[PDB]
């Protein structure tokens, strides 16, 4: 049993990107899908699609990267440089609208989960609501 | 206890010329002509690359030795500036530049800032028609700095205000030489002042 | 430590141990001399330092350094301790204040005079 699937996903993604995989599957959950949406919408990942593996529901997340580079180590820049779990089972993190953080002077984002649904730090602020600060991404 | 001691020796230590006598610090005698080097038995010896601290410290000493203020009052102003809204560097120079004794010097009512100081302490100066004997009194825009009638006929005030005939005055100021009046138009901008001081180094000095 | 662990035990605020048990945590303590020996320095120094056993008003018996060129401290000399260890003599953690009570001030002292307690010479 995974201990915290959201973390598991953020990490499958962190890992897969570090070796520049084209995509990566993660056990499917409405919730994880919700997060993927923002990820795609914000353009950190090409996209994602539901796919069964061994007859079980996963989410093929399609990674995205920058262009090949110069000098030694022609490895591309990551689109998802960062990406960390904030709230966690056994240290849940909640915030009010006035406490939503401004990830990377705006160049980054934060994904909260509100009773209005999973939103980015700008959306949540827009609809004036707060909630569980799920993660950070830049 | 505003210092009080040999002055055309601070300029020597400060490398740059500090006009702390007004007159003479112009003639071929300000020493900065013959002996621009620091004072003392080692003033001519080979210089040793100053430390970051040294640079900042000397710069603070320069800017402050110009207005002849205490480190106490000097610091008080700087703190007040950090607190005010607006680039500390300038704001600070503005406040410095708003001391009555200073303004009395800018209007030429006196040769030096030191002389201008005594002129305030001795009541020869008037803000808006009322006497003000506080060298640190802060002049605000619109205030008219003048010379007490009773002082108007003073030998010094004559030679002085005479020497100001057809003489230029800072853009943020303005003086009617005849009536011996003057107005503080507005706070000088960094651009309005041109002191041998990089006030940024000063802000840094008070950040250590 | 896990957060649960921190909730369970939390961090321990570290306490501070005084170097000057001059009790009453006063700035100075008054005392009287007993011995008025001399001690050999340690580590790599060598000299005959003037020290003093002092019965403090704080019901304490301690060795206090006697700074300055020379002194006049006897056995029943009343003194004022000011706290300050002497890096060379382990066991000495307080200085005697020249200029107070029986402790005379250093005579012919012309520089760091406020210390050693010596009035200003009537230069003329």
């Amino acid at each position: 049993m995974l201990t915290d699937p959201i973390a598991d996903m953020l990490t499958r993604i962190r890992n897969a990107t570090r070796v520049y995989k084209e995509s990566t599957d993660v056990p499917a959950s409405r919730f994880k899908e919700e997060i993927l949406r923002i990820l795609a919408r914000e353009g950190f990942i090409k996209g994602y699609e539901r796919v069964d593996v061994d007859g079980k529901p996963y989410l093929r997340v399609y990674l995205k990267y920058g262009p090949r580079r110069q000098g030694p180590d022609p490895r591309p820049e990551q689109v998802i440089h960062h990406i960390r779990r904030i709230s966690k089972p056994g240290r849940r993190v909640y915030v009010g609208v006035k406490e939503i953080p401004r990830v990377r002077r705006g160049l980054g984002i934060a994904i909260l989960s509100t009773s209005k649904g999973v939103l980015t730090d700008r959306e949540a602020r827009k609809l004036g609501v707060g909630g569980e600060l799920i993660c950070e991404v830049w | 206890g505003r210092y009080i001691g040999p002055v055309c020796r601070l300029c020597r230590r400060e490398g740059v010329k500090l006009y702390l006598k007004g007159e003479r610090c112009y003639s071929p005698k300000c020493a900065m002509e013959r002996r621009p080097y620091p004072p003392g038995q080692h003033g001519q010896k080979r210089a040793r690359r100053p430390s970051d601290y040294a640079v900042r410290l000397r710069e603070k000493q320069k800017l402050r030795r110009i207005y002849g203020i205490s480190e106490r009052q000097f610091r008080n102003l700087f703190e007040e500036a950090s607190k005010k809204k607006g680039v500390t560097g300038s704001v600070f120079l503005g406040l410095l530049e708003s001391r009555l004794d200073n303004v009395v010097y800018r209007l030429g009512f006196a040769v030096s800032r030191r002389q201008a100081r005594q002129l305030v302490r001795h009541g020869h100066i008037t803000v808006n028609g009322r006497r003000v004997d506080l060298p640190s009194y802060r002049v605000r825009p619109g205030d008219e700095i003048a010379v007490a009638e009773k002082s108007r006929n003073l030998e010094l005030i004559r030679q002085n205000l005479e020497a100001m005939k057809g003489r230029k005055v800072g853009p943020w100021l303005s003086l009617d030489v005849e009536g011996m009046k003057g107005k503080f138009l507005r706070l000088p901008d960094r651009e309005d002042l041109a002191l041998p001081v990089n006030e940024q180094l000063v802000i840094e000095f008070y950040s250590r | 430590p896990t957060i649960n662990q921190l909730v369970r035990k939390g961090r321990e605020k570290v306490r501070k141990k005084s170097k000057v048990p001059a009790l009453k945590g006063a700035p100075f303590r008054r005392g009287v001399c007993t011995v008025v020996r001399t001690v050999t320095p340690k580590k790599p120094n060598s000299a005959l330092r003037k020290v003093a056993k002092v019965r403090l008003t704080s019901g304490y018996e301690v060795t206090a350094y006697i700074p300055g060129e020379g002194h006049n401290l006897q056995e029943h000399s009343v003194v004022l301790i000011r706290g300050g260890r002497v890096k060379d003599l382990p066991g000495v953690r307080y200085h005697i204040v020249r200029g107070v009570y029986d402790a005379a001030g250093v005579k012919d002292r012309k520089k760091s005079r406020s210390k050693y307690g010596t009035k200003k010479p009537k230069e003329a």
Binding site: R91, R92, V93, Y94 | - | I3, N4, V7
Partner: protein
Amino acid sequence: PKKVLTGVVVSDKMQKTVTVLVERQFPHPLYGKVIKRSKKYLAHDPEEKYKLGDVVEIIESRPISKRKRFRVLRLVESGRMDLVEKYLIRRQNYQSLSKRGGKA
């Protein structure tokens, strides 16, 4: 408003009085993680009307005795010793940590 709390009856061994264990949840003042804390209350029960496992609503009331300032405002749900048992075991747990100790 008079306070109203909800808890489980963990004691019935008193005449006209039941012990109500009330639970409370909240983020830790410095470490954040939500932590469960609780307190036992001695609510007043004139008709011996309530028994163990009973989840009741306690209401702030005029003192009925020393150590007893609440009345049983009503039953929320009947029988359920999952809670009583829990309480009891934690209590039985104590029957250990000392000089002797059980085996649990």
